[PDB]
Amino acid sequence: RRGLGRRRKSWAKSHGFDYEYESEDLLKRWKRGVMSTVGDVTAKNVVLGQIRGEAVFIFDIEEVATVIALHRKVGTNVVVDLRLKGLKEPRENDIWLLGAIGPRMVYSTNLDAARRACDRRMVTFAHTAPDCAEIMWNEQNWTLVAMPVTSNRAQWDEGLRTVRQFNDLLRVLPPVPQ
To answer: What UniProt keywords are attached to this protein's entry?
Structure first.
């Protein structure tokens, strides 16, 4: 809430990441998760960095969410969306409920592929990931986590760990066909 910009700039500096107050085109690259229920907004308090060689972007969508987007090494056409049970189902018409895990529900565009990704490590993760990681999902070349904008620097650090763990679990999603 208060001092959000100063605190986000300090956290960017700790991580060796760049900070920008706003980026006018950033949001256009993602279409699902929290991006489908918003429009005519720009990314604010933007942090641009890398995790072990892969781009990571952290930004606020005013009064909606703080998002962390991590670049995937290999693309996929499957979407998995793991979100807290009390939230609305994804509104898109190509994605369906696979099942509940603990505090969360899993939705996917390919139920068979998502079943393969939902092994013991996924079950443990859905129970252990913090409740602040409200919606986690992937798109073709990115894995993302959305949390409340009131999250703090400890929650931003836990979000980096959460998006990395979720991305690792989705490495099994099939490659884009040639």
So the answer is: Cell inner membrane, Cell membrane, Cell wall biogenesis/degradation, Lipid transport, Membrane, Transmembrane, Transmembrane helix, Transport
